[PDB]
Amino acid sequence: KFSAKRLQTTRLGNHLEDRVNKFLRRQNHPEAGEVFVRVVASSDKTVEVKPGMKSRFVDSGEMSESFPYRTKALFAFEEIDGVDVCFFGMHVQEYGSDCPPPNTRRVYISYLDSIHFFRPRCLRTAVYHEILIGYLEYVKKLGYVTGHIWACPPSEGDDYIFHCHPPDQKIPKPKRLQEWFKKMLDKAFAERIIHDYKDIFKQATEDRLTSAKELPYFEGDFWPNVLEESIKESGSGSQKLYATMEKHKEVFFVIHLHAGPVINTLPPIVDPDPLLSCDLMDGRDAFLTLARDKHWEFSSLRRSKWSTLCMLVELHTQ
Ligand SMILES: CCC(=O)SCCNC(=O)CCNC(=O)[C@H](O)C(C)(C)COP(=O)(O)OP(=O)(O)OC[C@H]1O[C@@H](n2cnc3c(N)ncnc32)[C@H](O)[C@@H]1OP(=O)(O)O
């Protein structure tokens, strides 16, 4: 069977799915179909500190040369007209309790994408927020302490996950996307899922951050390349770092899942799900490449239904 439901289930996927369908049952809209959330790939990686930061801080013994993390790719599918339609995807990076500072017990959303065919339309945004809120709730329970978001919308024609978006699906500019995450986090706050969130500038200030080595270092994030430039441009760049953090502060969220002294007393983070080896969905380039090479577009509902079928056949028949 090629259905989204028969894709391998996980605790993480089930938690998100249960939250979404719970919310949909409260809404009682007759157009809404069942939602399936599936983790389709999961692997362990390391991000290596780039050469400039490495020469300054790693070789003097002040910073780890690399940080291990688990990366997960997940998809949400909805029943529409009796078939599965993939409508949302997200990749995450999880730096567990064996990861050295400054990354210990942190999660980072690498990127997220969607195709706007969720039915009914009036519930689409709410469903996206429930998935994100569910993810924060889950990693909090496992023992992650801080979550990180970079609110950077794609450039015109740069598909993040889904090849060929619908032509009439508008791309939010930074201001709209920032408020969209704020709305999501405000709802997470009201449910006691997060303790607070802050911008990166306010966070560094409260932490009295004085060196670039204290800034969490994530694969593909803004800051490692900024830091390479600060070291090339050139002495202590800490003053300029605060100007850079301040200039871009609205787009960089720091989310506190736990706060206070408990954060140094938590048990080890042990992931109850196995890794899921799926080269096609690990990273974004493979799936984009495959869809491009096979003319799998998501630019209308009919094409999205077809491309979802083809993706499910690929996922099942490795
Ligand atoms: C940390 C790293 C990451 O998370 S990646 C950064 C976020 N990811 C992306 O931007 C990928 C592409 N974007 C998307 O897939 C979606 O926009 C996401 C982010 C999922 C949000 O979708 P959604 O919940 O529908 O909110 P939305 O703001 O996109 O649409 C709401 C209404 O606003 C409109 N809108 C959008 N952009 C504009 C615009 N530039 N000018 C005028 N209007 C705009 C939309 O048309 C939409 O209208 P409507 O009220 O739903 O009919």
**Dist. CA 278 → ligand 1 center (Å):** 28
Question: Structure solved using which method?
Answer: X-ray
The two structure tokens encoding residue 61: 């013994």
Inter-helix orientation angle 124-142/174-190, to 10°: 60
On the 0-12 / 13-18 / 19+ scale of CB atoms within 10 A, 114 is buried
Residue 18, annotated as binding a ligand: no
On the 0-12 / 13-18 / 19+ scale of CB atoms within 10 A, 314 is middle
Resolution (Å) of this entry: 1.8
Task: Show the 3-state SS of the chain.
Answer: CCCHHHCCCCHHHHHHHHHHHHHHHHHCCCCCCCEEEEEEEEEEEEEECCHHHHHHHHCCCCCCCEEEEEEEEEEEEEEECCEEEEEEEEEEEEECCCCCCCCCCEEEEEEEEECCCCCCHHHHHHHHHHHHHHHHHHHHHHCCCEEEEECCCCCCCCCCCCCCCCCCCCCCCHHHHHHHHHHHHHHHHHCCCCCEEEEHHHHHHHHCCCCHHHCCCCCCCHHHHHHHHHHHHCCCCHHHHHHHHHHCHHHEEEEECCCCHHHHCCCCCCCCCCCECCCCCCCCHHHHHHHHHCCCCCCCHHHHHHHHHHHHHHHHCC
From 50, 43, 48, select the one nearest 103 (Cα to Cα).
48
Phi, psi angles (nearest 5°) of residue 99: -85, 135
Distance in angstroms (rounded) separating the CA atoms of residues 147 and 16: 17
Inter-helix orientation angle 301-316/285-293, to 10°: 110
Residue 114, annotated as binding a ligand: yes
Please say whether the dihedral angle defined by the alpha carbons of residues 299, 71, 102 and 64, taken in this order, is positive or negative. negative
The two structure tokens encoding residue 165: 């978006």
Distance in angstroms (rounded) separating the CA atoms of residues 44 and 99: 12
Q: How many CA atoms, within 13 angstroms, populate the side-chain half-sphere of residue 6?
A: 9
Residue 112, annotated as binding a ligand: yes
Q: Which residues line ligand 1 (CB under 6 A)?
A: 109, 111-114, 116, 124-125, 128, 149-150, 152-154, 160, 170-173, 176-177, 180
Closest Cα to atom 45 of ligand 1? 170
Q: Are 144 and 107 in contact (CB under 8 A)?
A: yes
Q: Are 196 and 189 in contact (CB under 8 A)?
A: yes
**Dist. CA 125 → ligand 1 center (Å):** 9
Q: Where are the domains of the chain?
A: 4-316
Residue 125, annotated as binding a ligand: yes
Distance in angstroms (rounded) separating the CA atoms of residues 88 and 95: 23
Best of 149, 165, 177 for a ligand 1 pocket test (most atoms within 8 Å of beta carbon): 177
Closest Cα to atom 38 of ligand 1? 172
Phi, psi angles (nearest 5°) of residue 267: -70, 170
Best of 107, 114, 169 for a ligand 1 pocket test (most atoms within 8 Å of beta carbon): 114
**Dist. CA 183 → ligand 1 center (Å):** 13
> Which of 143-166 are b and which e, b meaning 16 or more Cβ less than 10 Å from the residue's Cβ?
bbbbbbbbbebeeeeebbbbbbbb
Residue 124, annotated as binding a ligand: yes
Please say whether the dihedral angle defined by the alpha carbons of residues 14, 20, 21 and 22, taken in this order, is positive or negative. positive
Inter-helix orientation angle 238-247/200-207, to 10°: 140
Residue 51, sorted as left (phi over 0), alpha (psi -120 to 50) or beta, turns out to be alpha
CA-to-CA separations, 196 to 78, 199, 250, 259, 278, in angstroms, rounded: 32, 11, 15, 9, 35
Breaks in the chain, named by the residue before each, with C–N above 2.5 Å? 234
Strands 196-199 and 252-256: what pairing?
antiparallel
Distance in angstroms (rounded) separating the CA atoms of residues 287 and 292: 8
